[PDB]
Amino acid sequence: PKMKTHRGAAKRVKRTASGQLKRSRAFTSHLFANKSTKQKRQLRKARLVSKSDMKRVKQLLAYK
Amino acid sequence: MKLHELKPAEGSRKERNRVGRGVATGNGKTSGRGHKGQKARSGGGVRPGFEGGQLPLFRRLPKRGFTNINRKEYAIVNLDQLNKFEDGTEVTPALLVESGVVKNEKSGIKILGNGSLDKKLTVKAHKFSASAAEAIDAKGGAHEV
Amino acid sequence: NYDVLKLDGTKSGSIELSDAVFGIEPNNSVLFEAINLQRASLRQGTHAVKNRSAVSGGGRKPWKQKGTGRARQGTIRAPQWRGGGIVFGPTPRSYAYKMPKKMRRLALRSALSFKAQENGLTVVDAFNFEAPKTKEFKNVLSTLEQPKKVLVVTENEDVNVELSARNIPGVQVTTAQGLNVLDITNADSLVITEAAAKKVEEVL
Amino acid sequence: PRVKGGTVTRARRKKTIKLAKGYFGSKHTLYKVAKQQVMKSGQYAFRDRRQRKRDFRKLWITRINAAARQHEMSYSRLMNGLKKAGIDINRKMLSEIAISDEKAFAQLVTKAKDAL
RNA sequence: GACAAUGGUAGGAGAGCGUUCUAAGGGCGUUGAAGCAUGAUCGUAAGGACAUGUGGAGCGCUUAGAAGUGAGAAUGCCGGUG
RNA sequence: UAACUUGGGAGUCAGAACAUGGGUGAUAAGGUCCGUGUUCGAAAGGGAAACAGCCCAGACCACCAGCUAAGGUCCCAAAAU
RNA sequence: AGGACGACAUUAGACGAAUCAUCUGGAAAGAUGAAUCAAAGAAGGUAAUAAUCCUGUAGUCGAAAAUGUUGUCUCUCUUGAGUGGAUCCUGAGUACGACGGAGCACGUGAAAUUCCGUCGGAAUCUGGGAGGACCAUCUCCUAAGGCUAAAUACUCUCUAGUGACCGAUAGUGAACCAGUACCGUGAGGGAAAGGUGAAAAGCACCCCGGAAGGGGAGUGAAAUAGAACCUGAAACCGUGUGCUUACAAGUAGUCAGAGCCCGUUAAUGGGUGAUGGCGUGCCUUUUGUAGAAUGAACCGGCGAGUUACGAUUUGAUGCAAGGUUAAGCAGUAAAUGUGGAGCCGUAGCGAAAGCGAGUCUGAAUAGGGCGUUUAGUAUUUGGUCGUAGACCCGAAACCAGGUGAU
Ligand SMILES: [Mg+2]
Ligand SMILES: [Mg+2]
Ligand SMILES: [Mg+2]
Ligand SMILES: [Mg+2]
Ligand SMILES: [Mg+2]
Ligand SMILES: [Mg+2]
Ligand SMILES: [Mg+2]
Ligand SMILES: [Mg+2]
Ligand SMILES: [Mg+2]
Ligand SMILES: [Mg+2]
Ligand SMILES: [Mg+2]
Ligand SMILES: [Mg+2]
Ligand SMILES: [Mg+2]
Ligand SMILES: [Mg+2]
Ligand SMILES: [Mg+2]
Ligand SMILES: [Mg+2]
Ligand SMILES: [Mg+2]
Ligand SMILES: [Mg+2]
Ligand SMILES: [Mg+2]
Ligand SMILES: [Mg+2]
Ligand SMILES: [Mg+2]
Ligand SMILES: [Mg+2]
Ligand SMILES: [Mg+2]
Ligand SMILES: [Mg+2]
Ligand SMILES: [Mg+2]
Ligand SMILES: [Mg+2]
Ligand SMILES: [Mg+2]
Ligand SMILES: [Mg+2]
Ligand SMILES: [Mg+2]
Ligand SMILES: [Mg+2]
Ligand SMILES: [Mg+2]
Ligand SMILES: [Mg+2]
Ligand SMILES: [Mg+2]
Ligand SMILES: [Mg+2]
Ligand SMILES: [Mg+2]
Ligand SMILES: [Mg+2]
Ligand SMILES: [Mg+2]
Ligand SMILES: [Mg+2]
Ligand SMILES: [Mg+2]
Ligand SMILES: [Mg+2]
Ligand SMILES: [Mg+2]
Ligand SMILES: [Mg+2]
Ligand SMILES: [Mg+2]
Ligand SMILES: [Mg+2]
Ligand SMILES: [Mg+2]
């Protein structure tokens, strides 16, 4: 049968033009009194999925 | 070519590797699996994305966004693609589809301003980029939504 | 330009056949793929074996896990047992696959062009057979001085030509639409009527 | 299609057994223990081709020593003298000379002694 | 022609040997096929010939295709025999 | 004479001794835990009687040719009574 | 609900072309030479391999009787439209609601849409239901009665066929008097076992022997094919012999080597081996195994990364700003033709509205992220991954339905 998308991953990433995966950031849920102004400001900015993580997860998002 | 002299193209075919057929092959015995552990077992190996109990990447990262039920997406045509029609032509969605510039219309035709228009045309599309409309008008043509 | 002969071997005229069909340089890679594809498509694939689930019986453990001194066993139908189930083995399946249409057409053209360049292309004005007669058709082949393996191409289904050639070893009869790489390649010479040649030219 | 075991197995095993011809008892008869022995034979032969050069050089040297002693000279001093004299006859030839014509060897010994 | 490299387990890469079957071509066989046995034969290896005996009717070779394709061990299964 | 980048395929996550810098233990252990090196692992050949880990040295094949290493030269046993 | 006639088909059959000679050989179909038929060169058999010897094949013909499917008559039944909007009808314990469950891809959720139990409970065309809570508007339908062929699923079975499916440890458990023998109280479990020869011509007769068995004789191409009788490997058991061995400490060989005996795919040969040097099997598992760790009595056979569908990557090939069809239909179970729905690409960015070679963030024409300033796509070999038992063997157990108090 067809391979199945990992739905949580599909809800957590977006494919860029070059094939990378844009992701959002951990530590952005609560407990903001314990993180510095700079920490929160910079955690606001999205990142990419690292190469080493991509090696592991790429098949989960092959249709994405 | 003859049925008794068939020959595939060079490099088109390669004999498959057969494991567990003796030591000289280099894939005998453990058949390239190494020694023992989960990964050596028939049907062995963990789920893709499993990190042996470390919280996986796609659970430590958060979800983002939503999908718009009424999302619209347009079939895009650039000026460089319009460059193939004869000056004076009335380019319409039907003409784009017949000419093969547009294959799937999606929510309709939007003209975008990439490349250079070199011809006077009357372009009908559901939407236009500001730059695309300016180029169409400046080349002496007309545009209409 | 090719000569057009009569069944008695004399020249009836000349015909012009597009070099874009009969005159290309044969593409051997595409031709090999086409031949392999047709041969694969001819397979029936009806082969099977019984795995351990499929072999009759075998349910019980043949003896207790420990204490008897024997190797441990779980079913008399395990693969190492005489009469046991087969591990993997053939299982019914198709061997057919597809190639792009342009490549199919290129293969047909390449086979026809190979015939034309090997001079195994003979154009005949028509087959005027009213009743089937294997002996008349054998004589026609002999007068045309054809080799053992001949593919005879008619514009459309010619009942009497087919019936006359049917029993002659090495002689195969087809139509312009029914032309295929295996037949063309297998034949040593092609004998095509003028109307068939034009029709093939149109199609390809 | 099915490929039954066929004849290849017997052909291969028979080749091993024929190579085990002459061995003691089961070792020239049963494929497993014959195969094992033929492996050991191959390893031994590889090793012994190299050991044989050692062995024959050792023999030659022993014989040269005996001849030199017969001429009141040690092997070591004879080889040093021959080297200093520029004579490159190798041990095997020296031994064969000492065995076959003693006068030639005596002349060589005198060449060595003069060089020393 | 020169001169440089060539120990090796897990493992990666490459080139090949052999088995059954198919296609096409080209061959062998009661003046004796396969199989079996023996031999002092050939190739760098897997392996390939030739001769003779036995046997009594089927089988190579070339190119390509396809796999139930190669055993020495699983207190492996079955048979035979120590 | 490598180095780096991208991509296909891995295996490995029990290590051992020896030397040396250290902790622990008793300036015990063929102990245990780190640092550094070598060898074994995955390395045959020579020496250390025999002897994975020590000393010498890295086997493409053949030779009844030569020079050496560690280690040796009265006999076993090659070479200095 | 019937009836008459006709057609076709099924269940037996019939006709059906064309070869002789010689050589080898037990036998000719083989080889050789010379012929012939073919709408028939499918196939099997016949003393070896046959288009022309037989059974057949192409083609044509054929049914007393029964059955099946059909056509026409007969038979049977049967009105079909428009205009009007006064009144009437248009499915009730129903729709629906609450609570508890269930089903919907949808786990109670914002939960529409649909069912069950319990309790409550409408409206009546100015009506009622739905468009994913709900309300309005709009749009589309008209529940709570019933029937309905075809396209779809499957094969115990019959007929005709097919296979880069097996060929006696395979293939069915079962090629054979097999669900038998045998085991079990029973449910139930469940084998082994094919081959004389063309023809039985299956060994008259004589001889030893109680017989068995054998030696002749005979049949036969062959008995060295004589009854589980084609071939007839290995383990294993015997007889004879060339070389060798009773002062020797042996993983059994290897390298060196006299003596003796032979004579080959004729090669700087073969068998044996006084004596010398060297030398603790193999596999597995280990830091490390001669290991006194594991496994194998021996020999033979059998016995483990496969296939399907997706993904990815590489090689190959076609086409290229394009590439490509799926189902379907036609075709010989083929190639192939047709089929452009769909898929991928030619544009990205953003959660989204949206804007667009730019976009998002941002007050910003700042800065920063992701992008632009060409190449894809289809099929396919190889590698790898995913879903499948997923390289093979092995639990203790768990659940369901049965069989047992001899
Ligand atoms: Mg938050
Ligand atoms: Mg590999
Ligand atoms: Mg390879
Ligand atoms: Mg290796
Ligand atoms: Mg591997
Ligand atoms: Mg293992
Ligand atoms: Mg391990
Ligand atoms: Mg591992
Ligand atoms: Mg036992
Ligand atoms: Mg079976
Ligand atoms: Mg086998
Ligand atoms: Mg040396
Ligand atoms: Mg190497
Ligand atoms: Mg196998
Ligand atoms: Mg220690
Ligand atoms: Mg420790
Ligand atoms: Mg260290
Ligand atoms: Mg290790
Ligand atoms: Mg060592
Ligand atoms: Mg030593
Ligand atoms: Mg080296
Ligand atoms: Mg000495
Ligand atoms: Mg007849
Ligand atoms: Mg005859
Ligand atoms: Mg006849
Ligand atoms: Mg409810
Ligand atoms: Mg509602
Ligand atoms: Mg409702
Ligand atoms: Mg709504
Ligand atoms: Mg309406
Ligand atoms: Mg129906
Ligand atoms: Mg077979
Ligand atoms: Mg048999
Ligand atoms: Mg059975
Ligand atoms: Mg059976
Ligand atoms: Mg027999
Ligand atoms: Mg003695
Ligand atoms: Mg092994
Ligand atoms: Mg241990
Ligand atoms: Mg042991
Ligand atoms: Mg163990
Ligand atoms: Mg044991
Ligand atoms: Mg065995
Ligand atoms: Mg797998
Ligand atoms: Mg009682």
Swiss-Prot record, chain A:
Single GO cellular component term: cytosolic large ribosomal subunit
Any GO molecular function: structural constituent of ribosome
Pfam family, one: Ribosomal_L35p
GO biological process: translation
Protein name: Large ribosomal subunit protein bL35
Region (Disordered): 1-48
UniProt keyword list: Ribonucleoprotein, Ribosomal protein
PROSITE patterns reported for this sequence: RIBOSOMAL_L35 (PS00936)
Lineage: Bacteria, Bacillati, Bacillota, Bacilli, Bacillales
UniProtKB/Swiss-Prot annotation, chain B:
Residue stretches of biased makeup (Gly residues): 42-52
Positions of the UniProt region annotated as Disordered: 1-54
Gene3D superfamilies (UniProt xref): 3.100.10.10
UniProt family annotation: Belongs to the universal ribosomal protein uL15 family.
Short name of any one Pfam family annotated for the protein: Ribosomal_L27A
Biased composition (Basic and acidic residues): 1-18
An individual GO BP term: translation
GO CC term, one of those recorded: cytosolic large ribosomal subunit
InterPro entries: Ribosomal_uL15, Ribosomal_uL15/eL18, Ribosomal_uL15/eL18_sf, Ribosomal_uL15_bac-type, Ribosomal_uL15_CS
Complexes and interactors: Part of the 50S ribosomal subunit.
A molecular function (GO) term: rRNA binding
Function: Binds to the 23S rRNA.
NCBIfam families, sorted: rplO_bact
Protein's name in the database: Large ribosomal subunit protein uL15
The organism of origin for this protein: Staphylococcus aureus (strain NCTC 8325 / PS 47)
Keyword annotations: Ribonucleoprotein, Ribosomal protein, RNA-binding, rRNA-binding
UniProtKB/Swiss-Prot annotation, chain C:
Gene Ontology molecular function terms on file: rRNA binding; structural constituent of ribosome
GO biological processes: translation
UniProt keyword terms in alphabetical order: Ribonucleoprotein, Ribosomal protein, RNA-binding, rRNA-binding
Entry-linked InterPro entries: Ribosomal_uL4, Ribosomal_uL4-like, Ribosomal_uL4_dom_sf
Region feature Disordered, mapped onto this chain: 48-74
Domain of life: Bacteria
Disulfide bond positions: none
Function: One of the primary rRNA binding proteins, this protein initially binds near the 5'-end of the 23S rRNA. It is important during the early stages of 50S assembly. It makes multiple contacts with different domains of the 23S rRNA in the assembled 50S subunit and ribosome. Forms part of the polypeptide exit tunnel.
Family in the record: Belongs to the universal ribosomal protein uL4 family.
Subunit structure: Part of the 50S ribosomal subunit.
Stored NCBIfam families: rplD_bact (TIGR03953)
Protein name (database record): Large ribosomal subunit protein uL4
UniProt organism field: Staphylococcus aureus (strain NCTC 8325 / PS 47)
Gene: rplD
Curated annotation (Swiss-Prot), chain D:
Job description of the protein: Binds directly to 23S ribosomal RNA and is necessary for the in vitro assembly process of the 50S ribosomal subunit. It is not involved in the protein synthesizing functions of that subunit.
Coiled-coil spans in chain: none
Lineage of the organism: Bacteria, Bacillati, Bacillota, Bacilli, Bacillales
Keywords, in A-Z order: Ribonucleoprotein, Ribosomal protein, RNA-binding, rRNA-binding
HAMAP family assigned: Ribosomal_bL20
A single GO BP: ribosomal large subunit assembly
Record's keyword annotation contains rRNA-binding: yes
InterPro entries according to UniProt: Ribosomal_bL20, RIBOSOMAL_L20_CS, Ribosomal_protein_bL20_C
Name listed for the protein in its UniProt record: Large ribosomal subunit protein bL20
Ranges that cross the membrane: none
Organism (species): Staphylococcus aureus (strain NCTC 8325 / PS 47)
GO CC aspect terms: cytosolic large ribosomal subunit
GO function terms (MF aspect): rRNA binding; structural constituent of ribosome
Family according to the record: Belongs to the bacterial ribosomal protein bL20 family.
